[PDB]
Write a protein that binds this ligand. Structure first.
Ligand SMILES: O[C@H]1CC[C@@H](Nc2ncnc3[nH]c4cc(F)ccc4c23)C1
Length: 167
């Protein structure tokens, strides 16, 4: 039993809710919240900008030190950093950005990072400003992640479409 509430169950291990991931993180304080990161960990907008804003820019300060030491992430890769006031840990995962021409096949590699964590609160990778089809992203999630994932979908309209079209 865990503290996630109000989710619809899609599969054995995948759950979904219409929620603001920032507010969901603030209430649950999950072990892991996933950020929709880019390779530079520049948290300017989308999920990343909202998560970073909720940390009062502490996420960005920590991220800049990470990049200065380690260099950029790979598309499809991840790193574990602090969850600040939102979670124990933040798993920064880089899905491909269609608006930059990155290969959508890398979306499966991105979701594989979730399998290193038993339970996660996450957004749909490559959705929103990353330009992928969220229905495709949900399918890849279900077919790739084997650990327990709680998906927060900010837009109520998209949430309804994702549920109604789910196979
Ligand atoms: O909107 C759709 C497309 C992308 C996906 N993004 C999110 N998913 C879950 N929680 C989210 N909180 C946010 C706060 C923001 F300022 C911006 C985006 C998000 C956001 C859902």
């Amino acid at each position: 039993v865990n503290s996630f509430s109000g989710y619809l169950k899609l599969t054995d291990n995948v759950y979904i809710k219409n929620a603001d991931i920032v507010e969901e993180a603030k209430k649950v304080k999950p072990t892991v919240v996933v950020n929709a990161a880019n390779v530079y960990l520049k948290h300017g907008g989308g999920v990343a900008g909202a998560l970073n804003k909720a940390t009062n820019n502490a996420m960005q300060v920590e991220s800049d030190d990470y990049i200065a030491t380690n260099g950029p992430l790979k598309v499809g890769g991840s790193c574990v950093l602090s969850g600040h006031n939102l979670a124990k840990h933040c798993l920064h995962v880089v899905g491909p950005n269609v608006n930059k021409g990155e290969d959508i096949q890398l979306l499966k590699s991105a979701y594989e990072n979730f399998n290193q964590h038993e339970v996660l609160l996450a957004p749909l990778l490559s959705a929103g400003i990353f330009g992928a089809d969220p229905i495709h992203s949900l399918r890849v999630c279900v077919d790739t992640v084997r650990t327990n994932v709680y998906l927060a979908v900010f837009d109520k309209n998209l949430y309804d479409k994702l549920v109604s079209s789910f196979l």
